[PDB]
Design a protein around this ligand. Structure first.
Ligand SMILES: CCCCCCCCCCCCCCC(=O)OC[C@H](COP(=O)(O)OCC[N+](C)(C)C)OC(=O)CCCCCCCCC
Ligand SMILES: CCCCCCCCCCCCCCC(=O)OC[C@H](COP(=O)(O)OCC[N+](C)(C)C)OC(=O)CCCCCCCCC
Ligand SMILES: Cc1ccc(O)c(O)c1
Ligand SMILES: Cc1ccc(O)c(O)c1
Ligand SMILES: [Fe+3]
Ligand SMILES: [Fe+3]
Lengths: 309, 309
């Protein structure tokens, strides 16, 4: 029993997609027609039953009810795939990406405190927090230190929770989220704590689907970056804390060579005083290099829904 | 950009689908691998940008947040498509379906009061309700009246709202929802009111998408039926009130020839007095004929999540 390639079904697909309708958006119709065709065909090819189908529809409802579509997305590789496409396009334009891009993730929040050159990111409310001094230089497309660049950093606490998405309700707004404008030497520097790896809500729809694929929902400890500057494209990337068990087994497939960074532990009193901290701390250095706009246009910035507080 | 066909993307798709993982459900992995492959390819063929992609992800959260995946499904033709498959399968088995099946819709509620041969379905709470006497006979696969068949009926009020899903504040539980056991002559008879067509929540995600396709989100006035009996398959169908503006332009594509019924209006005192009502009323007669089990089993019953009370 096969009906997908019969006139009845093909004509019905055009009707449902609004192809012969006068109103609407032709681009949406075009995409919907393709997606529907593909799904109708997959239902036939894989002999998906009604019981299976409705289980899929129920999952969609709970996926959205839990606001997890942006979490499942990277877990199913879309986020990284979109990055592969941008990389391919840059290669086509002859653009060399000194600092590789990687996924943004769904947890960026607009509105964080802004400062010049330095900022402390945490409020010391984490018991198990280990002091981290993260600093670096931002370079322009010509390799020269870039003053006034805006470096945005966000990461999780030791429990693997992000402010604004913390279930324990423990964190104040923008905790571990800052914008640092680079100083005269093109440098940025922050005092924060070493993040812990992130895990998907174990009871949520994203993890339940991953369980069906025999997969885990963990990410290694990492730090997110947005770096923007006049005359340059906006850089989206992240660094991984070297040594993490999941560095090369991230459920979001965000790891890339060049982004794994070593956290050097400092114990002597000399270093501690020089970075005036209260005791042993970790230090990470990470420089980032920007690319220039293409004929005055940032051909790769992404406009997507982001929480703004 | 064309990278879908490279080994890097093809292997990635296998990894993301857990195909190389030992745990999990092989059936789910099989379906996920196909759906991801098709979508990754659709993104390439249609050159879907990251901006477009994330609008799609946001829409998915909104769809589930409003619990409308089961409303969008029929709007995009899936529900009707699944029935087409069922019809094709029956046609191949030589099963002549006397009463045509059509979609269940997402508003069935389990546990309605039950009675033999007759019941009034509404609580008279609808100010504009017009009395409707709906009756008919249930026939077995041989064309013989079937006593003891269970006829389940549910429908909307004059505002297009159903009990348990009324946006304006609860109706009596199970208002306009009843189960009727056919009597000694295989008949069912109910007193209720004429329903008004249903329209999708105007500001909801389903209507928002339909707008982009230049389509409306309306359904003609209709009455749902579930009919079950020993030795026969469970029938899912509905009847359309003849004359409705959307009879042949249902956004859920559920109307079928043989399911459009005329509601005859009675105003003469003799009719009124005979059916013992309090004034003019409408009458609809609709008989249903059932099909026998296939090798002792109901090959088309659908088990899907349904609200129970
Ligand atoms: C609005 C239009 C939307 C159209 C969408 C069409 C998608 C196609 C549908 C495919 C559905 C896959 C069917 C999976 C399935 O048949 O069962 C999936 C599991 C169930 O667990 P079981 O243990 O098997 O249950 C049974 C326990 N018993 C045996 C004891 C009874 O549950 C799950 O959530 C996995 C399902 C998630 C699949 C979502 C894919 C989409 C993501 C982009
Ligand atoms: C987690 C894995 C899931 C992967 C899913 C991938 C989806 C495939 C890609 C989807 C591409 C959709 C592109 C839609 C688009 O580019 O714009 C869609 C419209 C927007 O209207 P505009 O007027 O342009 O808005 C702007 C008005 N301004 C200019 C004034 C600001 O909005 C909408 O909600 C329409 C959205 C339709 C998408 C639904 C898909 C579901 C199919 C089952
Ligand atoms: C997809 C995703 C989930 C959690 C994170 O912390 C992150 O950076 C990305
Ligand atoms: C999709 C849909 C919407 C409303 C209804 O009353 C119905 O039966 C089906
Ligand atoms: Fe993160
Ligand atoms: Fe209905």
């Amino acid at each position: 029993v096969k009906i997908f390639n019969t006139q009845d079904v093909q004509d019905f697909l055009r009707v449902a997609s609004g192809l012969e309708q006068e109103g609407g958006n032709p681009r949406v119709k075009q995409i919907i027609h393709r997606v529907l065709s593909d799904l109708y065909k997959a239902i036939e090819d894989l002999n998906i039953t009604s019981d299976e189908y409705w289980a899929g529809v129920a999952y969609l409802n709970q996926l959205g009810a839990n606001q997890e579509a942006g979490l499942l997305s990277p877990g199913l590789g879309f986020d990284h795939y979109l990055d592969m496409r941008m990389d391919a396009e840059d290669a086509a334009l002859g653009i060399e990406n000194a600092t590789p891009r990687t996924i943004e993730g769904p947890l960026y929040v607009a509105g964080a405190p802004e400062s010049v050159g330095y900022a402390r990111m945490d409020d010391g409310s984490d018991p198990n927090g280990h002091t981290l001094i993260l600093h670096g230089t931002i370079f322009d497309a010509d390799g020269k230190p870039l003053p006034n660049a805006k470096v945005e950093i966000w990461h999780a606490n030791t429990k693997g929770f992000y402010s604004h998405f913390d279930p324990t309700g423990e964190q104040q707004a923008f905790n571990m989220r800052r914008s640092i404008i680079t100083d005269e030497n093109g440098q940025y520097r922050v005092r924060t704590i070493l993040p812990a790896g992130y895990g998907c809500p174990p009871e949520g729809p994203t993890q339940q689907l991953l369980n069906q694929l025999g997969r885990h929902g963990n990410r290694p400890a990492h730090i997110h970056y947005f770096v923007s500057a006049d005359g340059h494209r906006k850089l989206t990337t992240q660094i991984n804390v070297a040594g993490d068990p999941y560095t090369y087994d991230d459920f979001a497939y965000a790891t890339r060579e060049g982004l794994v960074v070593d956290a050097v532990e400092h114990t002597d009193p000399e270093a501690i005083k020089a970075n005036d901290v209260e005791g042993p701390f970790a230090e990470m250095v990470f420089d980032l290099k920007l690319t220039r706009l293409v004929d005055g246009v940032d051909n790769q910035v992404v406009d997507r829904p982001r929480l703004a507080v």
